[PDB]
Each structure stands twice: as structure tokens, then as C-alpha cells.
């Protein structure tokens, strides 16, 4: 299907306690493959997936160089932002940036993006046309005017449509064994009496990849998006994912409820039934 490459950066000022913390992480789909942390000891972009270990020295030198220049732009950006908002220079502030590209099934450019946040709120974003910006407030308008004059969208657009996609593809070929895999979920159901007239029924999805999944409960075939409890999908820590959906049911009516599981790695969607 479609695939993504995404870098996320977080930069936090630390007045009175050291230099700004910078953290950078790259992903392909739901798999992390690189990172940089200002506080770590390597001071290098570091691999976190095996296929990226293939890459040679030129590559790691280059990614390290670039991530340090990102760090430095952000270090300056914290100073400017505090000036734009007339903020006392005695407070911890947070900048966030995400950019990346998506490709469709045919591995050709679908979409690009570049978002920026200050203190947890939208500041500026490139719009889907890769040509203009949305600025959330008057400070961001100042950045927008500047970036318009300096023809920044254009440089960014050439990356999103060119380099980004060309390396996404490269990564997908090189890391084919994992990135192009699906791990179908392992599934099962638990029963838990809570009282003489209720039981909690829980649906469990374990060891799946990618993260995208839908667990829904049906009574007599009719959807119950009303009274299910769903947990946010969570990481297993081994590269796979987990999720459950629970439903509290009147006693004696278990055989009427069924769990359905939609995941990319399943031949067809699963109905799990309460059959004694």
C-alpha cells in the first residue's frame, strides 16, 4: 500500500540549567530507523533499525552534519520566537517540527508536509499544495512574509517531491524484509464476571504491524460503537503493537456478542465468537 517517511524534532529551552535539549527521530511507516539526542554521548545520528546499518560512512557523516545544522537553526529559533512574543527570557519553551513525504502503492509521490509548533500549538504549516503557508498568529505571519520573500516553499517542495521520495524508496527496497512485511494480529478473548448480572468481555489484539487496526464489538450483528471501551494502541517494545476493546454485558448474553478485527495482515476480517 502507501508508505511514509517522517522526521520529528523537539527542541526545549532550559534557562538556568544548560543548553537547549534537541531530539530528532526518523520513521518509515511505523518503524523508527534513526535518532539524535543532544544529551546522548555519540553526538551522531544513530541507527535504530537493521536495514539502515547497511549504509556506509558517507551517509552517517552526512546525516549527523544535517541533524546538527537542524539543532542549530532551532537553537536560534527559540531566541527569535521569544522576541516575537515579547516573552521574558526566563522560561522553558518548546518548539516542535514534523516534515515528510508519502508515496502510494506505486511508490510515487502522493503527498508532502511540514508542520511547526511553538509551546504545543500550531505556529506555521505548509499547505497541501506545497506552495503556500498557514500561519496561526501574527508572529507566524512574520515568519510567513519572510519565508515567502525567500522562496522557501519552493526549496521545500523540490525536497518533498524529489529527495524525500527517492530515499523513501531506497529504504523500502533495502529494508524489504521488515518494512514490507505485515505481522497479522494474534487474537483472543477474555471473560470477567463483575457481578451477578454483568460480565466484562475483552477483545485482545497482539503482535501486529503496522499499528493501524480496528477492533469493534457487535451485538446480534449491529455495531456497538456506543458502549465499548477502546484503549489507544500501544507499542509492544519489540516493533509490534497491541490493543484491546472491552464491553460490559448482561449475564447470559455472551453468545450474542462478537468481536471483529480489521488489519492489513489478515486475509479477510476476523469475527471472534463466544462459542462454548
Amino acid at each position: 500500500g502507501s508508505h511514509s517517511m517522517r522526521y520529528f524534532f523537539t527542541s526545549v529551552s532550559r534557562p538556568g540549567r544548560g543548553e537547549p535539549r534537541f531530539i530528532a527521530v526518523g520513521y518509515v511507516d511505523d518503524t523508527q530507523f534513526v535518532r539524535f539526542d543532544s544529551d546522548a554521548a555519540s553526538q551522531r545520528m544513530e541507527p535504530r533499525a537493521p536495514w539502515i546499518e547497511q549504509e556506509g560512512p558517507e551517509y552517517w557523516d552526512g546525516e549527523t552534519r544535517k541533524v546538527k545544522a537542524h539543532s542549530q537553526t532551532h537553537r536560534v529559533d527559540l531566541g527569535t520566537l521569544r522576541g516575537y512574543y515579547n516573552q521574558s527570557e526566563a522560561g522553558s519553551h518548546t518548539v516542535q517540527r514534523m516534515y515528510g513525504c508519502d508515496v502510494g502503492s506505486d511508490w510515487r509521490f502522493l503527498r508532502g508536509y511540514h508542520q511547526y509548533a511553538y509551546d504545543g500549538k500550531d505556529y506555521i504549516a505548509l499547505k497541501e499544495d506545497l506552495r503556500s503557508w498557514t500561519a496561526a498568529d501574527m508572529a507566524a505571519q512574520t515568519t510567513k512574509h519572510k519565508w515567502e520573500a525567500a522562496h522557501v516553499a519552493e526549496q521545500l517542495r523540490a525536497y518533498l517531491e524529489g529527495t524525500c521520495v527517492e530515499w523513501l524508496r531506497r529504504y523500502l527496497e533495502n529494508g524489504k524484509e521488515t518494512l514490507q512485511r505485515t505481522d497479522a494480529p494474534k487474537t483472543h478473548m477474555t471473560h470477567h464476571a463483575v457481578s451477578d448480572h454483568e460480565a466484562t468481555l475483552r477483545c485482545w489484539a497482539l503482535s501486529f504491524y503496522p499499528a493501524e487496526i480496528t477492533l469493534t464489538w457487535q451485538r446480534d450483528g449491529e455495531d456497538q460503537t456506543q458502549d465499548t471501551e477502546l484503549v489507544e494502541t500501544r507499542p509492544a517494545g519489540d516493533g509490534t503493537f497491541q490493543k484491546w476493546a472491552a464491553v460490559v454485558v448482561p449475564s447470559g448474553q455472551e453468545q450474542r456478542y462478537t468481536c471483529h478485527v480489521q488489519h492489513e495482515g489478515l486475509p479477510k476480517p476476523l469475527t471472534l465468537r463466544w462459542e462454548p
Partner: peptide, 9 residues
């Protein structure tokens, strides 16, 4: 593969 450079806000 990162951007070769980012521009100041």
C-alpha cells in the same frame, strides 16, 4: 534522509 538545511523562523 534529512533536508540539507532548514531556514530560520
Amino acid at each position: 534522509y534529512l533536508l540539507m538545511w532548514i531556514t530560520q523562523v
